[PDB]
Every structure is written in C-alpha cells, then in structure tokens.
C-alpha cells in the first residue's frame, strides 16, 4: 500500500525530508494524517488522483516549491499548513475547492492585498484560525467568514485598515497587527467596536502617534501598544475597559498623563509604561496619590521621572513636593 521512498504507519502518512519533488500517485485509501513537509514538492508536482481521498483530515505542507495555491487537494482537509513557501496567488476557485477548512497557515509567504481576491474567504465559512503573517499584505482583506475566532497579521506591510473589512466579525476573540507601518489616522475610525467577543488586541511596533478610542470593553483583557510613537492619551480611550487585566505600553513617546484616566479600570492588574520621558511637575501630581491608595495587588512598572535632571531615576510614589 506505502510507496518506495515514503514511508507509512496506520493513517499517519510520513513522506517528510525525503527531497521529493512531486507528491507520490498512490496512498493508502485510508489515511488521517498527511506529512510533506520540508521537501521540493511544487505547485505542478500535485497529481490529480489527490482530492480522492475522502478520510484525510490533516496535511503539513510547509517549507516546500508552492508558487500559488494548492489545486486538486482532499475532499476534507480540517487543518492545512502552508508555511515557509514562495505562495503568491490565493484566487476563489482553489480555495472553495476545499468545501471543509477549519484552519489555515500562510507563515513566510509573499501574499499582498492585491494577490487575493475580493470576496474569496466569504464562501468557506468553517474558518476559525487564519495566520496571514510575515506576508507582503498592504490592507486587510475585506471578504472574511464571521466564525473566525483567531487571526494574525503579525510583520506584515499594513498601512491602512478599511472599515468594513473587520466589520461583522461576532466571533472574533483574538488579533494581532505587529510590525506594521499602521498610524493613527490609517488605523480605522471606528473598526473594534463591533467585535465584541474580542479578548486579545496586539499592535507592537507602530506608526501610532496617539491611544486609540471606541475600544470593545465587553471581553478585552490584554492590550499591547508597545515599541510605538504615542504622545498622548485621552481619558476616553482606558475608559469602559472594566475587564482589562494588563496593558503593555512599553517604549513610547509619553511625558503627562491627564487627570482621571485609569479610574474607569477595575480588573486591572499589570500597568506596564516601560521606556517613557515621563515629565514629573505639578499637573501630573494626583499620580502620586493614586499609587499609594490601590496598587498592592496592582503592578504600575517602568514609571519613573525622566524631566528634570533632578529628580531623575526615582519613582513618582516616593516623590513629595
């Protein structure tokens, strides 16, 4: 039943680091998992006896030739991984030809805004985990299922976020946009009110020039705006966050903060402002007060006085004047 080269045990079919070029004609008619990871199989070494098999379930493509993507593939493929690979067009005819996809891997690739087509993902709606990172994305595809529960974008060239694009997404509980050219005008105007579900939000390395408001505080628990250009603050955008557990500001552009801005957060826990030129005078006097009332079983880390050369290197709560 197994080939010469490749290599099989009870469902679990290992073709892996074998360098093979094109996928074997024959595998067992019964199978669970496919393996054809890290080898020289291409976009053309697909054969057509492939989308045959009816108990597959599983198949591991990365690190392999794929110039687009896979045609003539399973009947049934609940997770498909396809990392590592030179993967540039993503058309609605191979994607819909997998009626069945609950995940999907697209690590490393070269897929832009542009490569996909409008509306493809919209067909598919068995889709809960997509990853779109290390890609060459300008935008996020506006053509998305609502049952997407996770979904990353992580060191990506995402500029600018359209509107209905994230609209919709009920479901929705993380996303994560590291490493991106996003600022505060190209982020969307109102674009993470509607996903209320959303529980983890990650926008680490920037062009953010200030905080973001119409935050969702119905299930948000994790925030990280860290490695970005943020001045300012307004008392609108921590505010409603009642479940936030931690906020990650580290290395940014702040110096003051106003008057009543952490008063709206209740679960809050870890108040991480590492690497800031905080400015320590007398409109920023009422921090003082409030590090000494609750935080016991609160952390507030990297808050220290950076203007004047003074008082430089000491924490606010010592501080009196």
């Given at each position: 039943s197994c080939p010469s080269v490749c290599r099989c045990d009870a469902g679990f079919i290992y073709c892996n680091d074998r360098s093979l070029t094109s996928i074997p004609v024959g595998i067992p008619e019964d199978a669970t998992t496919l393996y054809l990871q890290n080898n020289q199989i291409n976009n053309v070494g697909i054969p057509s006896d492939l989308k045959n098999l009816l108990k597959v379930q599983r198949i591991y493509l990365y690190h392999n030739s794929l110039d687009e993507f896979p045609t003539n593939l399973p009947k049934y493929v609940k997770e498909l991984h396809l990392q590592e690979n030179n993967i540039r067009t993503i058309t609605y005819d191979s994607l819909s030809?997998?009626?069945?996809?609950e995940e999907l891997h697209l690590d490393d690739n070269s897929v832009s805004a542009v490569s996909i087509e409008e509306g493809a993902f919209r067909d598919s709606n068995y889709l809960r985990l997509l990853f779109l990172s290390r890609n060459h994305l300008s935008t996020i595809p506006g053509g998305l299922p609502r049952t997407i529960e996770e979904l990353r974008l992580d060191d990506?060239?995402?500029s600018t976020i359209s509107s209905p694009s994230l609209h919709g997404l009920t479901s929705l509980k993380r996303l994560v946009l590291d490493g991106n050219l996003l600022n505060n005008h190209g982020l969307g105007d109102k674009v993470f009110f509607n996903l209320v579900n959303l529980t983890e939000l990650s926008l680490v390395r920037?062009?953010?020039?200030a905080a973001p408001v119409n935050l969702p505080g119905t299930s948000l628990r994790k925030l990280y705006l860290q490695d970005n250009h943020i001045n300012r603050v307004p008392p609108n955008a921590f505010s409603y966050l009642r479940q936030l557990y931690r906020l990650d500001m580290s290395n940014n552009n702040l110096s003051n903060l106003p008057q009543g801005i952490f008063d709206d957060l209740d679960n809050i826990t870890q108040l991480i402002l590492r690497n800031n030129p905080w400015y320590c005078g007398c409109k920023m006097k009422w921090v003082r007060d409030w590090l000494q009332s609750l935080p016991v079983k609160v952390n507030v880390r990297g808050?220290?006085?950076?203007?004047?050369?003074?008082?430089?290197?000491?924490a606010i709560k010592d501080l009196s004047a």
């Open positions: 030809k997998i009626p069945y996809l990506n060239r995402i920037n062009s953010l020039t808050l220290m006085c950076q203007a004047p050369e003074k008082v430089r290197g000491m």
